[PDB]
Amino acid sequence: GATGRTTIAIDPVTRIEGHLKAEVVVENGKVVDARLSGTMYRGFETILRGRDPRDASQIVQRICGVCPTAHSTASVLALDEAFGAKVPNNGRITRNLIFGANYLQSHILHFYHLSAQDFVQGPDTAPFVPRFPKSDLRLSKELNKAGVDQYIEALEVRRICHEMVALFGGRMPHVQGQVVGGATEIPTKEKLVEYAARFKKVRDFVEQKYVPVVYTIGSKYKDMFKVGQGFKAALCVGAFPLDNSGKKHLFMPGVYAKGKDMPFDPSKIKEYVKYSWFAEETTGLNYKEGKTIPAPDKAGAYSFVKAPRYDGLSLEVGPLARMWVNNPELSPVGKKLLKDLFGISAKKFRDLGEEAAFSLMGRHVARAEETYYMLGAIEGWLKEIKAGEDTVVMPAVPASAEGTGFTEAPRGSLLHYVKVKDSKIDNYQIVSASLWNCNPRDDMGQRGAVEEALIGIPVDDIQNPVNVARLIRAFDPXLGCAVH
Amino acid sequence: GTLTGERPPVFWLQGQGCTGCSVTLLNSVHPSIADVLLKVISLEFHPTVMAWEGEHAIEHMRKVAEKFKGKFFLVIEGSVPVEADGKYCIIGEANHHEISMVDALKEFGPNAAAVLAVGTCAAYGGIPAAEGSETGATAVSKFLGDNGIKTPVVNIPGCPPHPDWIVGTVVLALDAIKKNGLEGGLAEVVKVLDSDGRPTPFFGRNIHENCPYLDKYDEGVMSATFTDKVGCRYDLGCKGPMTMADCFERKWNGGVNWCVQNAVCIGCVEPDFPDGKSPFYQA
Numbered sequence A: 001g002a003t004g005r006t007t008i009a010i011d012p013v014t015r016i017e018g019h020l021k022a023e024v025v026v027e028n029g030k031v032v033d034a035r036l037s038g039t040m041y042r043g044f045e046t047i048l049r050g051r052d053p054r055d056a057s058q059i060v061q062r063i064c065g066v067c068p069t070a071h072s073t074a075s076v077l078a079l080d081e082a083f084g085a086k087v088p089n090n091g092r093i094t095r096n097l098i099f100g101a102n103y104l105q106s107h108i109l110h111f112y113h114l115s116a117q118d119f120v121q122g123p124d125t126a127p128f129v130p131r132f133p134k135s136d137l138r139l140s141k142e143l144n145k146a147g148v149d150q151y152i153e154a155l156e157v158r159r160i161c162h163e164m165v166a167l168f169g170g171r172m173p174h175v176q177g178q179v180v181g182g183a184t185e186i187p188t189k190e191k192l193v194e195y196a197a198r199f200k201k202v203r204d205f206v207e208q209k210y211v212p213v214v215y216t217i218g219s220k221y222k223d224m225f226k227v228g229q230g231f232k233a234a235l236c237v238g239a240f241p242l243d244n245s246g247k248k249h250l251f252m253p254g255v256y257a258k259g260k261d262m263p264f265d266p267s268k269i270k271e272y273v274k275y276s277w278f279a280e281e282t283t284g285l286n287y288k289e290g291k292t293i294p295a296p297d298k299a300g301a302y303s304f305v306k307a308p309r310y311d312g313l314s315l316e317v318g319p320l321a322r323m324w325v326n327n328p329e330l331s332p333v334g335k336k337l338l339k340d341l342f343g344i345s346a347k348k349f350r351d352l353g354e355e356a357a358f359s360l361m362g363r364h365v366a367r368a369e370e371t372y373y374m375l376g377a378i379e380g381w382l383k384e385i386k387a388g389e390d391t392v393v394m395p396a397v398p399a400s401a402e403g404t405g406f407t408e409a410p411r412g413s414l415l416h417y418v419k420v421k422d423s424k425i426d427n428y429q430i431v432s433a434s435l436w437n438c439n440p441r442d443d444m445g446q447r448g449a450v451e452e453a454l455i456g457i458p459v460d461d462i463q464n465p466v467n468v469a470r471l472i473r474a475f476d477p478x479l480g481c482a483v484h
Numbered sequence B: 001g002t003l004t005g006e007r008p009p010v011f012w013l014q015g016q017g018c019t020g021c022s023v024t025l026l027n028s029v030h031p032s033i034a035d036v037l038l039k040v041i042s043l044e045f046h047p048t049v050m051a052w053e054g055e056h057a058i059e060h061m062r063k064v065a066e067k068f069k070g071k072f073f074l075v076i077e078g079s080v081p082v083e084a085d086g087k088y089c090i091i092g093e094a095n096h097h098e099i100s101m102v103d104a105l106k107e108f109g110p111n112a113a114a115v116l117a118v119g120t121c122a123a124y125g126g127i128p129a130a131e132g133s134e135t136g137a138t139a140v141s142k143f144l145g146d147n148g149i150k151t152p153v154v155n156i157p158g159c160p161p162h163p164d165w166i167v168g169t170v171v172l173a174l175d176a177i178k179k180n181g182l183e184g185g186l187a188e189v190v191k192v193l194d195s196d197g198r199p200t201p202f203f204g205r206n207i208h209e210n211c212p213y214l215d216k217y218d219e220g221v222m223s224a225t226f227t228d229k230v231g232c233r234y235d236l237g238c239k240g241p242m243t244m245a246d247c248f249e250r251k252w253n254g255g256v257n258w259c260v261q262n263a264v265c266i267g268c269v270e271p272d273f274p275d276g277k278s279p280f281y282q283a
């Protein structure tokens, strides 16, 4: 025999950031359709209008308390461009140290505190119970206990990462230390010692616990490398400038779609709204001409997330996207465990192959590998920084200007565009990471990246449909970012 | 606390928040967040961290709420948007019925022992209620009052609050309740709230009057660039003079920095944040 249709709605999707409803159509044990709804709106793009442009680098951080340094960074880059501010070299490096520390925080938070319960049974008390009666928790008693022990240790490690952010960022969430013109606090020798001491502890945890546990848990869920492919299409806009030219970055830009690498041209971004709660006349706009006119009663729409498309393509973003586009060498422990636990011989990230990389478990692997990769970048910046050297310039506010800041938030590509008129914000448009991942259909009916990645996900037990949200969580969504 | 001790039930509902008030709590040093969750409270519903999901998570909260009617603590993070019949914030769906933040506060608000409005958005409206917004973002206390809901509210503001203000206010309340019972205990908490509903142990002192750069302010020695750490930050936009918080002493993130040392205070705990504290970078 076989089974017919069951339609399953999950609201709230938990162990993500923000407000998401997912609805899937299951036929014969697999998802055959999906709709994702961002169910909360604030409207930062209209709140920002009329303000002193410098206020943006504080206001925008409140889009998302998990990734505020990403919004800080995109905003100050946009303001730097609009103001003609020339960030001193030492300020560029200080910014990289502030922001890079939150990559470590965010990926560790994501794997352990958001994702790991997908595979690990926590202690027998809230918030770890109750849960699905058949949660498909496959780990041995010993390995499950390692997961719990590491979850608990990771609470301290992620906190230490925020201490690293705050050393030159002031506090976290919501840094004070990035402004137009650079960074507000010159690193001292003494505080660089404090950053390095914390960094060593984080490094040890990443190398010894986090990267190994992802491959080890993955080896008990090998079926999870065979689903979640979606479009197999990715975007990277570049991040972490490595010199003052604006042309060299830790993550270099690129698009990948239909098996082909292509350059990134931001003029090909358009945001569609047919299936989003925004006025119909605002559909199809590039961000330099973007408009944000809510329409919460518009028939047929199902999300406050706009639908960004790149030259018509629906793309995903995040660690997988960046690691696929840039194809770095894999970590030593990843190479070893791919051989020992999977029989896979691999040297660089693409040696996983397109199918396994673009998968539910591949996205967790990519995020762990990227965390390891960031260690080397931060170590480099700690050698490059010059204690005592100025990190900021103080530029006058222009009467009329525009600028765009591009970076990679922990969850994927982020840009902020600002237009200044009469010395105030005339328009401010944000195109964020979880916008690229968790958006609804476009005006042609083409699904968003996660919607498409849900197709084919197995649901062999409609009463315990655990793989639907497991797939969603692999993308590390934050709906605050997606909607703003 | 102990793993086997008395731990009251807590539901954490997110309206128009950024999750920063959850993240800041995760940064608590002592007690650690692990100890808070396993030894101090029973966090029965929290969408960012809980095991279950969807209608099952909502129904779990409803079952606990029935068992502990009048006795659970309700944490609200984010503002409550009232425009468009609540559609700017849907928090869940159960029995094919969407649950707006408006609906959720009308359902659980009346049955809580107390509502802890965590963060400036929940306490005062904050950025979602600021100029240029259009969702009807409303503060918790105003929403509850407008709807005839008398449950006590304690505001723990900041954008985000310091973890110590959140955990410390919980500890304040749990101590008062241990000594006096629930109604007598909450009466003792209300007695130590300022006119903006904030606990005076954390919000009873002014930043500027306790600031290490106060001598420079009085001398008129003002930094002209952020990286000059000798002068006062007033000309760079510091709002310490108008701000009631203890950041000058407890500082942030394990004591490693704070806003005035690093840059400027933006007045994030104040009821008029952000508009009455803006522009941030001039006096």
Ligand code: SF4
Residues within 6 Å of the ligand: B207, B208, B209, B211, B212, B213, B214, B215, B217, B232, B233, B234, B238, B239, B240, B241, B260, B265
């Ligand atoms: S204006 Fe700010 S930096 Fe200056 S003394 Fe007051 S609180 Fe301190």
Ligand code: SF4
Residues within 6 Å of the ligand: B158, B159, B207, B243, B245, B247, B258, B259, B260, B264, B265, B266, B267, B268, B269
């Ligand atoms: S110093 Fe000012 S801006 Fe910083 S946390 Fe304290 S009150 Fe908020």
Ligand code: FCO
Residues within 6 Å of the ligand: A064, A067, A070, A071, A409, A410, A411, A412, A413, A414, A432, A433, A434, A435, A477, A478, A481, A482
């Ligand atoms: N990381 C992060 Fe936030 C999201 N999604 C942004 O951009």
Ligand SMILES: [Cl-]
Residues within 6 Å of the ligand: A066, A067, A068, A069, A070, A071, A102, A103, A106, A409, A410
């Ligand atoms: Cl970030």
Ligand SMILES: [Fe+2]
Residues within 6 Å of the ligand: A045, A306, A429, A430, A431, A432, A483, A484
């Ligand atoms: Fe946007």
Ligand code: NI
Residues within 6 Å of the ligand: A063, A064, A065, A066, A067, A068, A478, A480, A481
């Ligand atoms: Ni985010």
Ligand SMILES: [S]
Residues within 6 Å of the ligand: A017, A064, A066, A067, A411, A477, A478, A481
């Ligand atoms: S995020």
